[PDB]
Structures are given as C-alpha cells and as structure tokens.
Amino acid sequence: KGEAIGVIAAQSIGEPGTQLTMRTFHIGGAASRAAAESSIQVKNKGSIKLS
Amino acid sequence: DQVDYMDVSTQQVVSVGASLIPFLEHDDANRALMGANMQRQAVPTLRAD
Incomplete structure (x- = not known):
C-alpha cells in the first residue's frame, strides 16, 4: 500500500520509445x-477453421 | 561513344577533413562523420609525430 503505480507505468511506457529513437x-x-x-x-496436421 | 565528360579525381566528393581519413571506403558513413568531427578537436602536443 502506498505505491505510486501511475508514475511507474508512465515511465515504463515512455522509456522504450525514447531509447529506441536514440x-x-x-x-x-x-x-x-x-x-x-x-x-x-x-505447418502442422489438423483441421482448418474459417471465421 | 555516349560519354561527354569525366571526373578529375576520386576525392572530389569529400571535404578536406573527410579526405584526411585513411581507408574511408571501409567505414560506415556515421563513423566517417564522427571521425572527421573528432579529428579537428585534437590539441597539439610537445613533440609532433
């Protein structure tokens, strides 16, 4: 209890974009x-289904 | 017989700092640019070599 999960999630989403851009x-x-x-x-034996 | 003109030198495309690099054609272009930029920041030393 008391963990600021919103900042953690925002950083987790934001970091890879900047990193891979650089x-x-x-x-x-x-x-x-x-x-x-x-x-x-x-690639394998089985039935074929269409949706 | 179609040709009209021809280049004068293989180095008429690069600048001076880029033309001072040996074995340029075996280097990535980004590395060539980095080397050319860093080559002009070198301080002179006591004895030249």
Whole structure:
C-alpha cells in the first residue's frame, strides 16, 4: 500500500520509445522491410477453421 | 561513344577533413562523420609525430 503505480507505468511506457529513437543510428540507416508474403503455408496436421 | 565528360579525381566528393581519413571506403558513413568531427578537436602536443 502506498505505491505510486501511475508514475511507474508512465515511465515504463515512455522509456522504450525514447531509447529506441536514440538508438537508431547503430544499424547505419539501413531499411527495415520484410517481403510481403503471397500465400498461406500450414505447418502442422489438423483441421482448418474459417471465421 | 555516349560519354561527354569525366571526373578529375576520386576525392572530389569529400571535404578536406573527410579526405584526411585513411581507408574511408571501409567505414560506415556515421563513423566517417564522427571521425572527421573528432579529428579537428585534437590539441597539439610537445613533440609532433
């Protein structure tokens, strides 16, 4: 009892954004892109369900 | 036969501080900039080398 959880949560959310923004020059300006897949490929035996 | 002109030197693209760096083409551009910036903050010492 008496723990200021709101400040903790606000800091926890805020920190990674600033950190990763300031850590962007390590890769050297390279592009982050994955080729868009054009198919579905199941990996295991079982039934298929559509929703 | 299509060519009209040609460059004069391989170093006509960089500045002086960047052209004072050896093996520049093997370095990342950010590291090249950092090296060029830090190279001009070096204090002279007792005996030059």
